[PDB]
Amino acid sequence: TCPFYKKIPGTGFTVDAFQYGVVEGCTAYFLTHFHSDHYAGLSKHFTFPVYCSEITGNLLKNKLHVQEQYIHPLPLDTECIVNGVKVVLLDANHCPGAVMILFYLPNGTVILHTGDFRADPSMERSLLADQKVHMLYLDTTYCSPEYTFPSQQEVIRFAINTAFEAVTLNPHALVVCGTYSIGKEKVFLAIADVLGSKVGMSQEKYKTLQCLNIPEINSLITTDMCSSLVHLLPMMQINFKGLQSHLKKCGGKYNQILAFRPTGWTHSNKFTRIADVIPQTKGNISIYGIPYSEHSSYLEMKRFVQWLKPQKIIPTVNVGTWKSRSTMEKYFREWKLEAGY
């Protein structure tokens, strides 16, 4: 059964609710982004209207085989009427094709559903600026002050400089980057660009990337692993055993691996600056964990909410325990008392 925080009151709409069977009273199913916890349940046999971004719709059609007649892509930053209700999709600064959804209810209530997002001050000048929001359905993944991490630009600077130094010292070094979903493509594209290489990967991953409307992508990626010195592998293979094994396969072309694991937050964030990050090493293999996040830090979240001044907050993440829920509700009240709304 579909939980309440996936339903939009006063509509026939649900958000990211594909794993509950036919939801009683739902006339349109919205999908915020192509991540498995959110799309769980979609397939070629789905026969209800799905509303999403263009990029999400490419992935539904080519990866899950959903039939074209049930895919309804909407442009961003554009007022659209869906089953008699005005909606707008906004960029969520999450993975490719990820959106927030603004719903303008027939009774005058305005609801923002963030999906998964990384709040940014640029959002304070979107179509959000133009009216009041009553209810906020909020990605609370990192809603606690211990969760700090650097900007995406500082992390990519660290990665490019690390990779370029290593391969200039040793032209026979291979760089490997882990992946298990869409998102974080800047990691591997930036390093390949500094090295003058395409990124090599499996056919299944090349197919996924070809659905993303990234400019000039044919110039940056390839399935010919032999011609590439940046390889993508599944995140589970980024360990000493899996990397030793991969290095065998390259036929003595390479004699060293430098590998990156873009994680979210890890507790090494509480003590160490990005400048100070060191790898784990074993022999001719080094593994860097880099804190590249596509979710808001605690401070980015707080700034967005204090700017928006919603009348009510509904968390969408960490809702399964009473301790989490009580912690989140305490921070929400702090933020409201500090800002005065």
Minimum separation from the CB atom of position 94 to Ni ion (A): 6
- The DSSP secondary structure of 284-336, one letter per residue, reads TEEEEEE---SS--HHHHHHHHHHH--SEEEE-SS-SSHHHHHHHHHHHHHHH
Beta strands in the chain (DSSP E): 7-8, 13-15, 28-30, 50-52, 71-73, 80-82, 85-91, 99-104, 110-113, 135-138, 173-179, 199-200, 221-222, 230-234, 256-262, 280-282, 285-290, 312-315
User: What's the half-sphere exposure (Cβ side, CA atoms, 13 Å) at 56?
Assistant: 30
Bridge pairing between strands 256-262 and 285-290: parallel
∠ CA 281-285-287, rounded to 5°: 60
8 A C-beta contact, residue 76 and residue 98: no
Residue partners of 235: CB distance under 8 A and separation at least 6: 178, 179, 180, 261
CB 36, min distance to Ni ion, A? 9
Taking the complex as a whole, the smallest distance from the CB of residue 116 to Ni ion amounts, in Å, to: 4
Question: What's the min distance (Å) between Cβ of 115 and Ni ion?
Answer: 8
Question: Least separation, in Å, of the C-beta of 40 and Ni ion?
Answer: 12
Smallest distance, Ni ion to C-beta of residue 37, A: 7
- Output 66 or 99, the one with its CB closest to Ni ion: 99
Binding site for Ni ion (CB under 5 A): 35, 116
Q: What gap in Å lies between CA 23 and CA 25, rounded to an integer?
A: 6
By C-beta, is 35 or 303 nearer to Ni ion? 35
CB closer to Ni ion, 115 vs 289: 115
Closest to Ni ion by CB, 197 vs 293, is 293
Beta carbon nearer to Ni ion, 164 or 298: 298
- Whose Cβ is closer to Ni ion: residue 98's or residue 199's? 98
Q: Which residues contact 74 (CB under 8 A, 6 or more apart)?
A: 51, 52, 53, 54, 80, 87, 89
Minimal distance in Å, beta carbon 141 to Ni ion? Answer: 9
Q: Which is nearer to Ni ion, 99 or 258 (by Cβ)?
A: 99
Q: Between residues 119 and 259, which has the closer beta carbon with respect to Ni ion?
A: 119
**Nearest distance from C-beta of residue 35 to Ni ion, angstroms:** 4
